[PDB]
Amino acid sequence: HHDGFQTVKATIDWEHPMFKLYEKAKRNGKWNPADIDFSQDQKDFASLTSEEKISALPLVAGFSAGEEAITLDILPMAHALARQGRLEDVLFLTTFMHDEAKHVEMFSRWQQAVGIGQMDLSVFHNDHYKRIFYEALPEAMNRLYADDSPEAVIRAATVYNMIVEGTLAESGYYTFRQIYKKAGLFPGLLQGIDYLNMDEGRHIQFGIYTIQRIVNEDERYYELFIRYMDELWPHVIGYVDYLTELGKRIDYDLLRHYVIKQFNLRKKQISRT
Amino acid sequence: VHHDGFQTVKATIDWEHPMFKLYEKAKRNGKWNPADIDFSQDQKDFASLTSEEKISALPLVAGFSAGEEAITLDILPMAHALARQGRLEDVLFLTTFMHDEAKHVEMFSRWQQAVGIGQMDLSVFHNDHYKRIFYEALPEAMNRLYADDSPEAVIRAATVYNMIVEGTLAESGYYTFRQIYKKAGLFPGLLQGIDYLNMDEGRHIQFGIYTIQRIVNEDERYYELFIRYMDELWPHVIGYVDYLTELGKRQQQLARTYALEIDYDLLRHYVIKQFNLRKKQISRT
Ligand SMILES: CCCCCCCCCCCCCCCC(=O)O
Ligand SMILES: CCCCCCCCCCCCCCCC(=O)O
Ligand SMILES: [Fe+2]
Ligand SMILES: [Fe+2]
Ligand SMILES: [Fe+2]
Ligand SMILES: [Fe+2]
Ligand SMILES: [Mn+2]
Ligand SMILES: [Mn+2]
């Protein structure tokens, strides 16, 4: 039951950081994936050699699955914060969710346009990928229906924001750029990736805000945060090694260092105080 | 529980799904930002009213602010349930639904802030009937879906929120606010807000009808449930309406300072009109 309503008893906290992030999201979040011209992307893909055609697909499969996952899986988080009365958080998360829907849509549209929509790209998810996306992610998010303790929220934000978006996805945008914009290939996908990377700058900020406000109440949670990151590293780098083994069949030595860099950078964005 | 796989890895989005088409319309037609509305004439208009004129609109604003905030919290279980059923295109659409409702909450709260009543607690205009729908039945029917996503649970949730709250009360609210404050040349920024809001809600009702009718096509037993759930809520619908009516009648200072004939019997029949129209948008097959 609702006890009352903040915009009836009072107003929105206009000075809340997440309400300000909400405002930014409405201003900077107007792109529509339906407007992306994929026609050159189709030609590029067709002109590729089958050996080149596959080289693209592992990454797209990682992302298509990853965006769809978070679209389905943020909803428990939004619900738990709604139940705690954090209205400005909820306002922000509606932009988060619609961003992610556009992300799902964009990769799906590219798949469709280059002609691989009928292809099942699950074959490029290895065990380590499945551990993160098929298992740990939904596990940590769905927990929050029955357990919204600080430890549960921090574990979900760490998994979704610091590992999935902040290590794997950040590293993936960089990989796409380091490979295809140099080549002059796939300009519509790279356009989408650029819009998406803008969106994701906001998403990481909600995650930092969330993890940090909890850490602030008890620095015991800081060590929780680090432990959770390290728990998932073996699957992060297991996936990366799987993908680097594939491409060698571009210095994957560099992209495997960018992943390592991102992971440590994300750890540093949270302070013990 | 874990994901089996992902539709946009095995396949693609179902581009011909009607909820995808509705998602596409939502993106194209849902660009308005309440932060852009000019409330300066509203703040002056509100200040130009007496204490007694000043309140005639607040009961409506309190019903609206509470209603928009409730659904912002209470749609989330519905989106989760459909996500669990693999209804990806529904979920995509629902991201626009939820973001719309966020803007609706924001708009009324901006208006309250700008006209100067942010500090005033407007809960006093929620009578027991209002509470039974918005403080109780709405969240009960939605939160159910976390543990019971059966067709009958989904019908009930869509009926409460989409057919009653949006399609009866909110549709009547927009009419009332037009029949009164557009005729009074009052609160232009609020009515611009309400215009945009009402456009949003045309899509929301289409999702609710799609959802209810989808379930009724599986089995007609469910048509009767829809009618019964509509009927179980009518008394609170009309209980709130009578209450809002008796308020307006005894604070009639704004009606005659602005030479308006506010017909609280016409407004009452429009509510009844919306209720039955909503029944007619669901067919037994
Ligand atoms: C060979 C170098 C490795 C490059 C790393 C690529 C990893 C693929 C990206 C998958 C994660 C995408 C998750 C979406 C996050 C979000 O939607 O916020
Ligand atoms: C005297 C005339 C009575 C008219 C009825 C007025 C009722 C106020 C409506 C408040 C509910 C608003 C819910 C909005 C639903 C949505 O945002 O989708
Ligand atoms: Fe994201
Ligand atoms: Fe391994
Ligand atoms: Fe709505
Ligand atoms: Fe009563
Ligand atoms: Mn994303
Ligand atoms: Mn609304």
Residue numbers in the entry:
A (entry chain A): 3 to 251, 263 to 286
B (entry chain B): 2 to 286
What does the report in the manuscript say about this coordinate set?
The heterodinuclear Mn/Fe cofactor is found in the R2 subunits of subclass Ic ribonucleotide reductases (denoted as R2c) as well as a related group of proteins known as R2-like ligand-binding oxidases (R2lox). Although the physiological function of R2lox proteins is not known, the cofactor catalyzes formation of a tyrosine–valine ether cross-link in the protein scaffold. Both contain the ether cross-link, and both co-purify from heterologous expression hosts with a long-chain fatty acid ligand bound in a hydrophobic channel leading from the protein surface to the active site, hence the name ligand-binding oxidase.
Crystal structures were obtained of all three R2lox point mutants in the non-activated reduced and the oxidized resting state by soaking apo-protein crystals with MnII and FeII under anoxic or aerobic conditions, respectively. It seems to have displaced the Y162 side chain, particularly in the reduced state. Judging from the crystal structures, it appears likely that the barrier for photoactivation is lowered due to steric hindrance caused by the bulky isoleucine sidechain, making coordination of Fe2 a more favorable position for Y162 than in the wild-type.
